[PDB]
Design a protein around this ligand. Sequence first.
Ligand SMILES: Cc1ccc2cc[nH]c(=O)c2c1
Ligand SMILES: Cc1ccc2cc[nH]c(=O)c2c1
Ligand SMILES: Cc1ccc2cc[nH]c(=O)c2c1
Ligand SMILES: Cc1ccc2cc[nH]c(=O)c2c1
Ligand SMILES: Cc1ccc2cc[nH]c(=O)c2c1
Ligand SMILES: Cc1ccc2cc[nH]c(=O)c2c1
Ligand SMILES: Cc1ccc2cc[nH]c(=O)c2c1
Ligand SMILES: Cc1ccc2cc[nH]c(=O)c2c1
Lengths: 537, 537
Amino acid sequence: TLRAAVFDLDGVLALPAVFGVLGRTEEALALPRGLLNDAFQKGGPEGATTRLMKGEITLSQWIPLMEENCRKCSETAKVFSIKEIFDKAISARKINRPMLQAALMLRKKGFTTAILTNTWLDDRAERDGLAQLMCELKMHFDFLIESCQVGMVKPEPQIYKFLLDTLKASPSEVVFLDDIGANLKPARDLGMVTILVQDTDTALKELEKVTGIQLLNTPAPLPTSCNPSDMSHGYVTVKPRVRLHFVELGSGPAVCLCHGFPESWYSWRYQIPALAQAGYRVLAMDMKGYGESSAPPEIEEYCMEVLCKEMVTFLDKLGLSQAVFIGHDWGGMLVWYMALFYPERVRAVASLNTPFIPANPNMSPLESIKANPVFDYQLYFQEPGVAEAELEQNLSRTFKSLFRASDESVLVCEAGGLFVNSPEEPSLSRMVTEEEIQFYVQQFKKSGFRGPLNWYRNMERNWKWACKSLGRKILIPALMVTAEKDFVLVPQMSQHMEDWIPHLKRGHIEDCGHWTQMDKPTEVNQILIKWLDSDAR
Amino acid sequence: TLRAAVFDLDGVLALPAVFGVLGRTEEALALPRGLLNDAFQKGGPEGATTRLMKGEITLSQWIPLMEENCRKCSETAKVFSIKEIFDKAISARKINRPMLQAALMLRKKGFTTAILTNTWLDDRAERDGLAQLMCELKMHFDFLIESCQVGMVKPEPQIYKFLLDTLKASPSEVVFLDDIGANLKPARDLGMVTILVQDTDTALKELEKVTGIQLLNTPAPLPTSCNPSDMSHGYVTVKPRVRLHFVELGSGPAVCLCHGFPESWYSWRYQIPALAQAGYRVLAMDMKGYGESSAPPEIEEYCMEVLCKEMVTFLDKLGLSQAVFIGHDWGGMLVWYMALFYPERVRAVASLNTPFIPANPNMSPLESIKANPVFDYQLYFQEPGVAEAELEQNLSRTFKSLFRASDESVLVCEAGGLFVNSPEEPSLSRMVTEEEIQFYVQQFKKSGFRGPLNWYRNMERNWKWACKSLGRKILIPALMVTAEKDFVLVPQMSQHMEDWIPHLKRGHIEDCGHWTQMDKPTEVNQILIKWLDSDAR
Ligand SMILES: Cc1ccc2cc[nH]c(=O)c2c1
Ligand SMILES: Cc1ccc2cc[nH]c(=O)c2c1
Ligand SMILES: Cc1ccc2cc[nH]c(=O)c2c1
Ligand SMILES: Cc1ccc2cc[nH]c(=O)c2c1
Ligand SMILES: Cc1ccc2cc[nH]c(=O)c2c1
Ligand SMILES: Cc1ccc2cc[nH]c(=O)c2c1
Ligand SMILES: Cc1ccc2cc[nH]c(=O)c2c1
Ligand SMILES: Cc1ccc2cc[nH]c(=O)c2c1
């Protein structure tokens, strides 16, 4: 019975193989057939290539040794840069997405996965390209065994016993995929299930046949999520009693993600890996009042002016002159005001669902809010302690009731609460796992709902502050993402935004409810990456 | 008696003034005198400029309003891009270093300092330049009062009462510096000491006369240091029982600072702000065994192979494909081995004091170490518990005894310890304050010296591992910084490094002891920044 799956890198998880370049160069340059493949293989287990693969020498030391082997092979046959050929071959090699997806599905079903590869110590000036590829790939496997790190190469029998010992599995429990028949043989001899990989489709057909798990023709997978315990956690004190916590991933321009109510940095779990992979340094906040960030009890600690000043202090303390600010729900309203009051500090601004809403100077914000009845539920949030009591009463019930797709609603507010005619034990939304709900439950045990609710308790102060910006326009790069099925933050509420943000760009997600990030993560990622790459560097 | 100092930005803390561009443009373009200065000032307290300065409109909205004022002024006089003129004026404006140094000296002597400025909300595509300038400047002051944020401008009397209220000082306690006589007048009326700033030298002469503090002709100041409570603190779990803590500052290429024995991330306190200001994202580690990082008790948890693997995991979890690695003492030996075993992950490598030392395959590492007697003191570190007992006995004594310049030594090892004929209450080195020593004392109360000493307890394992690299060369960008007066890690010990690192660059610091970073911080900063900018992007 199979319990582990092992994959080769070149020609299996990454294509085109760095090998099918020696053959192409030969054909493109009309050289005698196999000449470059000969020079690459010269000396066998004693030659330059075996030394490179075992980590005895680096790639840069190997380049002149391969060049010398090439002249010797040309001399024998009786008949230009090796560096250039390999540089081009390495940069053209991309992850084989269907093969990676099959490895991901096997691990999700309980398989132990590993990459076993004959590789080198890359010290070329262009080494970052390969470092990036290996870093993206390795995260998805339990083990990465590199020949140059273990000082053993395939087909040597000891690398296979080393593999078995690493997996803590007997050979019959292992399926082993390789594109080189010679490197597959010792695995076969030990009793492992082997797959000679030529075309991906046939290899996966063989793989699904042996595992009894569907790998081909599967539904589109969700983007990579985050495991909290595996993230880098950052903490910045913005003032004596207030610290802000964030999760941080990637390199490049800073992108600051600002969640809504009643959420977490974790609401961005499907965005963080995708944006980091796209070339950005992601800073996913726990907003003031939430998770590991401070939660002072005072209502005025949560007015927009205070919240924005603290996010500016956050950038100051991290040594960031700017960040792109992306917000959802309350976080989306905060980001529009960051763009209006601190344009110097905002590289670009994007909001999911929340439109930019200016103050009406001729109407009280209480009059104005009552003219938009979808917000009647926010009146229930006004009286201190009332909504805290209901929402803190059963956290699992609170999160399972709230985090539901547009057609899964279980929730007027003069019924006497948000959960009056709601189930005491709601079903789990198709958007979340029980484990994800328990993460939110755990986060909210620290400070509960007082700080989060206080974000709604500053209408008058926020209106006075917003009035200072009535003569301004938002002229920095901006994106408004509407969600078809958000019944509170409806797409039509954003219709006047071009009057204030003339250069505004848009995105729109059909069949998407309020919880945009987890409702339509692939779509959110596609929209944000496209906009960041075109408007935020 | 003076207790606070207030500085203007344009023409005082930053030069050349964005004003002395209107006059220059007029002369360069042979326009009627004062025409552009007229159009800029049009409408007085009712005009476009006052609206901009109060934050009613942004800079991008003001540009076409100023253009219109220019055509009206040209029409009156009977006689090209405003955007281009202001873009050039803003980017040419640099911090007035002697003025900043005087503000720094006053604060160090107990003065409350503030910047009071008539400024704008900058939403130009080039706004980052100014954001960078303001971010560097503001960190050095207690308060930054911006006209566009408070909705008041100088010379309006209310901005001065607001200033006094912010400082919590009576007018007679405040000295106020401005380059505009009109903006100085209301401060004078209230009873504040005022300084009309034309040339910096005369202004500081007036400033030293009123404060009784020497500001002009002072010794060269030390670089900016770090206040631990003001830094962003990061934590990454690299394996179940091990987490690594780091301090993080700045944006740009990742630079990972690796301290020595028995040190802290704080040993880089003079480097962190300078490198971040230079355009780098600094990650200053607490190395395994230290400060807030985990300190497992097992000797083998501190072998070079394990330490390097964990630093690779650290990069993986942060989503960094590479970092520049800069090390000192044990950290310097770790960085050379990172370059040798993980070149793909090392953008560039630099070591302070520690030379790259290969394994001698024909000699036991114990034989080899005894052939270099300066290391005899490391034999004392071998027996578990012996050096822990002496070093943990009195932490203040330990750090004050160790952290001394080359001519301040108070420390053979068969005397029966490092502090045998050493003072029980050593004097404070000219390199450190009592507060800095107490920071180290506090850090070492958590785990003490077991983990740190374990770095020396893996000679045999490290030799076996290092032997795998004997056929390699370090061919990625590398810098070796020697310290004239380090009597253990002597400059001559690095003489063979070019044999292993042919493209090696060097730096050398005269009259510098073992504690390079705090001994010669300005010199260290100059050397590292120059090398990073030329070899690490
Ligand atoms: C959430 C919210 C929504 C709409 C408005 C409209 C006008 N004024 C407000 O304060 C307001 C607040
Ligand atoms: C429509 C509606 C009703 C209740 C709630 C309660 C808590 N949070 C929400 O976002 C919400 C939205
Ligand atoms: C600036 C702004 C815009 C909308 C709202 C809505 C409800 N409450 C607010 O405080 C608020 C503040
Ligand atoms: C705040 C808010 C806004 C919209 C929705 C829509 C559907 N379900 C919700 O819980 C919800 C909550
Ligand atoms: C600190 C140190 C210094 C020199 C050497 C020389 C040869 N071998 C070693 O292990 C060694 C270790
Ligand atoms: C020469 C010498 C002697 C003792 C010590 C003790 C602790 N740490 C050192 O670095 C050191 C260096
Ligand atoms: C690789 C290397 C080089 C020098 C030394 C010196 C002392 N101890 C070591 O373990 C060591 C390890
Ligand atoms: C490890 C080490 C190396 C050199 C020195 C030089 C002077 N003083 C020291 O304490 C010291 C410690």
